[PDB]
Design a protein around this nucleic acid. Structure first.
Ligand SMILES: [Mg+2]
Lengths: 225, 211, 429, 558
DNA sequence: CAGTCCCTGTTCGGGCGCCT
DNA sequence: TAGGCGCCCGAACAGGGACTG
């Protein structure tokens, strides 16, 4: 019966501050052992400790950042806060708030975790993706299989929803995690279907980008030359 | 700054097995180590606190061991969830610290990267730009190399890649790799080669084309 | 002149004069402290300088509490405490909460200063004089005396009992579920609530107190590893009596028989239903110890019988609050120690075994004193009186460091004894 | 002048009156001598003529100092002191140079008329009343009372010290970085200032006492090292003890020994290792005070070996804070022990010696332990810190001691210094009965009303022995039995007693004692290769005993 | 047990030594 | 002579444990 949820801004401009809010139920931040810990975890790398605000207000910070950190707590509302000043790209990451607690003379662990918030630092303006098909060329088909791809390039911010043939096709599909390009995202998806079905049967790429409120469909038409 | 080190980064195994992961400290931490499990999704849970005490609700098939500077985590007999990333945190002295984590994978009969290469979509070109996409699918294990030979000549100025996680269904990997060159420079050549170097065939797997 | 409340008179037991005890050496680290807490107590005028003209004296020393990291002055008022008693015991004693023992959590509050606000009988002051040494005897002794109830003198809590009962009327009626006992400089508070809920009520009583002048110390809780502050609370349940037990061998050499006879004999003084003839007969003639005697079926009859006797409540043992209390301690082995508290010989009221503090630094001195403290604490809670100790150590050795490890507001009465392994009796196994 | 210092109130012991002690007639030769003197003190303020109503009187005579041929006044305050209430003396130990710290500038002074400079309690003077008799049976002599601290009175010392301390009180608060060791009427002042400002301060000080009556005459050491303080010589870099003239006389009488021994002790504080146990015992016995006595050789090598060390010049150094302490112990003759305390390689700070035997039956860890205890305290007193030790006893020897012993013990941080004679228990009981030895069942008994009794044993192999003794008691007889069995036995044996007494004594692993019995019972133990003692409740029926009992119970009463 | 001796530990008092 | 402290000795002291009648 215990849970925490991190609230945030999801996206922060460089050299600005952000205030993460952990809202919990199930324990008080007034009871002895208790405290709340703010963990971090950059894209792909591993966990990092950031700070632990305790009930006695005897807060502890990660030395590397104390200068840009601060912790707070609205004990009556079961909320806990974390502020970071002058953020930079490297601050882009997922933040967790956990319910650290000190049970006994030797046991002090982070009993329950949140789910995290996605905080990313970018001075980019939400722009829709430009989509391009991937139809094989000079190596035009034989009685087997074939792979068709889709290219979503130059959008912001994450994420994108990509499906094939409006949700029809979902077996040999691979949507690859995106990557930054001139401070803009770019990803690819690959569908593989038996030649007995393409190009005979239409195969389309479904691309959705929430932020810019756009949805585009791309028909994988076989190449001409 | 009590450095915590899990030597073993990516370790693969199989159901029913028994595994051990090591969390080497940087000084006598007197058994103040905790173990965390982070599933592929991302949720993080508490396995063992105080180097050998199982957190309530954890499967008995979980054991903790360690002393002074060397500590180990051992999973009885693998179930299909266990296969996940693992962390050990120290709390003998702030700042607190976590290992580098050990990703526990899945051993599958080794297979080869199905390569596919593509031309710059007419459209991409229309607007002034071109990228060569090259797919390497369902190969095994992870480690793999790519090379971009244009007109026999190699290049690395414009190469981007992306690796997928292990696919929970058929334990394999995939990998997109994109060569982003301009339009004037694309329409200034002929050969474009993607090259794949996987631990399955001495000869690099290759597929290519010429505008 | 601190308060216009009336001074209560006190007169030491007849034919006894004040305490004329010398000052033991003190370590710089301490002198330095004792000097400060003494300087500042004199300004506030709770204490007064004085010279050679006062023929009495007592020793002071200070202990850096590990509890709060704040030095505490300590005046060994045991002699005085002793010379004055018609007073604090018989006349106006403070009653005991039968059930303070019967709780699961109990904490102690150091309500010392609470005393610094009540005038001490002018005429009686001379008796509380003390002196401060100086390293390498640089200057003579700087000595003072009390003008207000002194910390750690059987009389204070006795006097301040009127005001201390009041201060609590509210809290006690707004939380009748809690228990409160005052033994000298301390307040014993124990509850049945969750620990977290206890900690609170304590931290709340701290306030209520503050709403009255009574300032209580600032115990610290560290966030690094040994969460020592986690034990600040006492639990009158992991408090289990330690009965004697007779070994369990498959076959018994001669040797192994004799010993087991002694124990059974010694223990015969405690519990009377212990017979040995039917078991000693098996050793009828001068035989090599090492010789494996087979236990008779007439024998193994009582061995397994008497043993059954060594697991129950003694021979109608009653505690008489009007008689002293004694405690013995036997250094068992590798960190273990055992004790027994009795009023009459072989009629103990309690028997147990203090395990060990992992940070006992493999120091017997340290562990012993700690046992004393620990054992003392239990006493106060259970019977509300301190026991006289029979310490297993050389006076001149104990007197050299007992301080270094002492962490308490009171000081019990002790003596030294060199009494060897009587019978593994006060059981090791 | 006289001080403005509040006078310290002194009363008389409870229920006593002052001294009303007659005066012995003196020679007109002495009388008119005193009269010069008192008149002088009277004008000086120290005393004052008293009225008739004063009943008290203490004796007073005069004596000559043969050198100056001048007379001096002496009052016999014996009775007053007998009557004077008792104080709580404040001087709590004498300071030691070894505790001083090197100071840029150092000065030492003294005060004149120390006592005659402090007011005596107005309400107590009437008791210091004395008479200075007339030349003849005419008019009553001259009566006088004291107004200042009388010399030779119980109070003078403590009162003057207290006073003095109060006086420096404000000065130290204003110059907290200057150490002044006040010892009675003497001031040692030292600071890390420049030889100029120092005086500018020292001066400020003298003008401070003068304001308070304390006359700082010109008998002060300024930039005059050696500074002669407390009996030592203080050198800028080191310190010596004012030479000691060892008595070398022809024949020695008890008393004359005391003068030596003591002197020697005083010397032990700096002169490395000193033995005295030797000639120490000479005095032992219910000796007299003038009785002559012959110096043994076991007492002669002492003097000889001692004089030796004392002949070679040595010196000590000052304490340095940062550099923690060190006390090294060395073994010596039977009972003796030596130690040097230091902080640098071989620059002794101080040195001493231990010889007390706490108990009759003791061993050599015990004593070492004891020596550490005493060394510790003795530091705490001079440095307010504990020292690190270097002891002749390997961790092995210790690790086994404190573990097996039933009495609790400890020793502070220490390493093992390899320098025999070393310390290590000589024998060792057994935990378990050994197989390949007879189990000797021992016992003994005696009759108080006779002084007689027997003692012997019965082995499992039917063997037997029973020696009878005279002038000995149960406890010695039971301790006697155990002696036989440790002769009349191999190199391995099991003994069985009923005396916790004898049992105890032994487990303690004694390795020396007072009585020979237990010095020999020790010898058998060090000799044998394996022993094991067990105990049984005599008079209980336990087999192996009954035998020996009856065997030695030939005289159970009457 | 009630009255007594044995034994060991500690306190005290005397000389001395040193200091002021 | 006073007060302090130190050493070394022997006496009266106190308490536990064992004995006897
Ligand atoms: Mg006997």
């Amino acid at each position: 019966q215990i849970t925490l949820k991190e609230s945030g801004p999801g996206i922060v401009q460089p050299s600005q501050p952000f205030r993460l809010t952990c809202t919990f139920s199930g324990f008080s931040l007034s009871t002895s052992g208790i405290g709340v810990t703010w963990i971090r975890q950059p894209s792909g790398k591993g966990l990092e400790w950031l700070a632990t605000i305790w009930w006695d207000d005897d807060n502890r910070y990660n030395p590397s950042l104390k200068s840009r950190l601060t912790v707070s707590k609205d004990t009556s509302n079961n909320q806990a806060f974390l502020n970071m000043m002058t953020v930079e790209t490297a601050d882009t990451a997922i933040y967790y708030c956990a319910q650290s607690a000190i049970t006994s003379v030797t046991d002090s662990a982070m009993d329950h975790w949140g789910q995290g918030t996605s905080v990313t630092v970018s001075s980019a303006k939400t722009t829709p993706p430009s989509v391009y098909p991937l139809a094989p060329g000079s190596a035009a088909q034989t009685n087997s299989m074939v792979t068709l791809g889709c290219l979503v390039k130059g959008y912001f911010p994450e994420p994108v929803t990509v499906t094939w043939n409006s949700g029809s096709l979902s077996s040999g599909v691979h949507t690859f995690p995106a990557v930054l390009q001139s401070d803009l995202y770019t990803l690819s998806s690959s569908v593989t279907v038996p030649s007995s079905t393409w190009p005979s049967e239409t195969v389309t790429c479904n691309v959705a980008h929430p932020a810019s409120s756009t949805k585009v469909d791309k028909k994988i038409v076989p190449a001409d030359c | 700054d009590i450095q915590m080190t899990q030597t073993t980064s990516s370790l693969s195994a199989s159901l029913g097995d028994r595994v051990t992961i090591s969390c080497s400290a940087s000084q006598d931490i007197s058994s103040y180590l905790n173990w965390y499990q982070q599933k592929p999704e991302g949720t993080v849970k508490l396995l063992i606190y105080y180097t050998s005490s199982l957190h309530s609700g954890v499967p008995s098939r979980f054991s903790g061991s360690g002393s002074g500077t060397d500590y180990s985590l051992t999973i009885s007999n693998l179930e299909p969830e266990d296969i996940a990333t693992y962390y050990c945190q120290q709390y003998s002295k702030f700042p607190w610290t976590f290992g580098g984590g050990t990703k526990l994978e899945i051993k599958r009969a080794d297979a080869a990267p199905t390569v596919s290469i593509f031309p710059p979509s007419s459209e991409q070109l229309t607007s002034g730009g071109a990228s060569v996409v090259c797919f390497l699918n369902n190969f095994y294990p992870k480690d793999i190399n790519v090379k971009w030979k244009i007109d026999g000549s190699e290049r690395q100025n414009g190469v981007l890649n992306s690796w997928t996680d292990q696919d929970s269904k058929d334990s394999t990997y995939s990998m997109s790799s994109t060569l982003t060159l301009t339009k004037d420079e694309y329409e200034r050549h002929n050969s474009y080669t993607c090259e794949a170097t996987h631990k399955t065939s001495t000869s690099p797997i290759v597929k290519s084309f010429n505008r | 002149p601190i308060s216009p409340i009336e001074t209560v008179p006190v007169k030491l037991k007849p034919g006894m004069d004040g305490p004329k005890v010398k000052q033991w050496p003190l370590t710089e680290e301490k002198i330095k402290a004792l000097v400060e807490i003494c300087t500042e107590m004199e300004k506030e005028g709770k204490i007064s300088k004085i010279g050679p003209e006062n023929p009495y004296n007592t020793p002071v020393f200070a202990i850096k509490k590990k509890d709060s990291t704040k030095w505490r002055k300590l005046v060994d008022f045991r002699e005085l405490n002793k010379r004055t008693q018609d007073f604090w015991e018989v006349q106006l004693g403070i009653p005991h909460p039968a059930g303070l023992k019967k709780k699961k959590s109990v904490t102690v509050l150091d309500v010392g200063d609470a005393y610094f606000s009540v005038p001490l009988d002018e005429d009686f002051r001379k008796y509380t004089a003390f002196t401060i040494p100086s390293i390498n005897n640089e200057t003579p002794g700087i000595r003072y005396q009390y003008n207000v109830l002194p910390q750690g003198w059987k009389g204070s809590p006795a006097i301040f009992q009127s005001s201390m009962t009041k201060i609590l009327e509210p809290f006690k009626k707004q939380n009748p579920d809690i228990v409160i006992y005052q033994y000298m400089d301390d307040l014993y508070v124990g509850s049945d609530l969750e620990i977290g809920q206890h900690r609170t009520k304590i931290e709340e009583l701290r306030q209520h107190l503050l709403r009255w002048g009574l300032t209580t110390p600032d115990k610290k809780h560290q966030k690094e590893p040994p969460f020592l502050w986690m034990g600040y609370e006492l639990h009158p349940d992991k408090w289990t009596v330690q009965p004697i037990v007779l070994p369990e061998k498959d076959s018994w050499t001669v040797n192994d028989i004799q010993k087991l006879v002694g124990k059974l004999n010694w223990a015969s003084q405690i519990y009377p239903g212990i017979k040995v003839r039917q078991l000693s007969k098996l050793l009828r003639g001068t035989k090599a110890l090492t010789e494996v005697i087979p236990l008779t079926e007439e024998a193994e009859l009582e061995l397994a019988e008497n043993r059954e006797i060594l697991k129950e409540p003694v021979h109608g043992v009653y505690y008489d609050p009007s008689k002293d209390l004694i405690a013995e301690i036997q250094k068992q082995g590798q960190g273990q120690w055992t004790y027994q508290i009795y009023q009459e010989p072989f009629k103990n009221l309690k028997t147990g075994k203090y395990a060990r503090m992992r940070g006992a630094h493999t120091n017997d001195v340290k562990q012993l004193t700690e046992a004393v403290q620990k054992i003392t604490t239990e006493s106060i809670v259970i019977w509300g009186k301190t026991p006289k100790f029979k310490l297993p150590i050389q006076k001149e050795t104990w007197e050299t460091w007992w301080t270094e490890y002492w962490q308490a507001t009171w000081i019990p009465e002790w003596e030294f004894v060199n009494t060897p392994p009587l019978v593994k009796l006060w059981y090791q196994l | 002048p006289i001080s403005p210092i509040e006078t310290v109130p002194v009363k008389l012991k409870p229920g006593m009156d002052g001294p009303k002690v007659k005066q012995w007639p003196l020679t007109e030769e002495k009388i008119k001598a005193l009269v010069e003197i008192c008149t002088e003190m009277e004008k000086e303020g120290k005393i004052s003529k008293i009225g008739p109503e004063n009943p008290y009187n203490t004796p007073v005579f005069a004596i000559k100092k043969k050198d100056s041929t001048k007379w001096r006044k002496l009052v016999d305050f014996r009775e007053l002191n007998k009557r004077t209430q008792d104080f709580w003396e404040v001087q709590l130990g004498i300071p030691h140079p070894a505790g001083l710290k090197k100071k840029k500038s150092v000065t030492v002074l003294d005060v004149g008329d120390a006592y005659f400079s402090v007011p005596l309690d107005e309400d107590f003077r009437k008791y210091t009343a004395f008479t200075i008799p007339s030349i003849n049976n005419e008019t009553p002599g001259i009566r006088y009372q004291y107004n200042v601290l009388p010399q030779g009175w119980k109070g003078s010392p403590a009162i003057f010290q207290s006073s003095m301390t109060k006086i420096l009180e404000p000065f130290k608060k204003q110059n907290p970085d200057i150490v002044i060791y006040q010892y009675m009427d003497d001031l040692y002042v030292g600071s890390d200032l420049e030889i100029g400002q120092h005086r500018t301060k020292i001066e400020e000080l003298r003008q401070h006492l003068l304001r308070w009556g304390l006359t700082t005459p010109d008998k002060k050491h300024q930039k005059e090292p050696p500074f002669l303080w407390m009996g030592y010589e203080l050198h800028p870099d080191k310190w010596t003890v004012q030479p000691i003239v060892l008595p070398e006389k022809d024949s020695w009488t008890v008393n004359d020994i005391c003068k030596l021994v003591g002197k020697l002790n005083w010397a032990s504080q700096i002169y490395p290792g000193i033995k005295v146990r030797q000639l120490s015992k000479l005095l032992r016995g219910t000796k007299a005070l003038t009785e002559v006595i012959p110096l043994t050789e076991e007492a002669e090598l002492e003097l000889a070996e001692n004089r030796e060390i004392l002949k070679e010049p040595v010196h000590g150094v000052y304490y340095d804070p940062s550099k923690d302490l060190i006390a090294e112990i060395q073994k010596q003759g039977q009972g003796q022990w030596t130690y040097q305390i230091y902080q640098e390689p071989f620059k002794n700070l101080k040195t001493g010696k231990y010889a007390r035997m706490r108990g009759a039956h003791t061993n050599d860890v015990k004593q070492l332990t004891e020596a550490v205890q005493k060394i510790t305290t003795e530091s705490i007193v001079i440095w307010g810190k504990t020292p690190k030790f270097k002891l002749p006893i390997q961790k092995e020897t210790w690790e086994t001691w404190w573990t097996e012993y039933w009495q609790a013990t400890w020793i502070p941080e220490w390493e093992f210094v390899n320098t025999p004679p070393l310390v290590k228990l000589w024998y060792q009981l057994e935990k378990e009965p050994i197989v390949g030895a007879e189990t000797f069942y021992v016992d003994g008994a005696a009759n108080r009303e006779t002084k007689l009794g027997k003692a012997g044993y019965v082995t499992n192999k039917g063997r037997q022995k029973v020696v009878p003794l005279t002038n000995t008691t149960n406890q010695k007889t039971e301790l006697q039995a155990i002696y036989l069995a440790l002769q009349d036995s191999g190199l391995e044996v099991n003994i069985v007693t009923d005396s916790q007494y004898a049992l105890g004594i032994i487990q303690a692993q004694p390795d020396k004692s007072e009585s020979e019995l237990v010095n020999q019972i020790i010898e058998q133990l060090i000799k044998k290769e394996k022993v094991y003692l067990a105990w049984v409740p005599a008079h209980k029926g336990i087999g192996g005993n009954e035998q020996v009992d009856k065997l030695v119970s030939a005289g159970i009463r009457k």
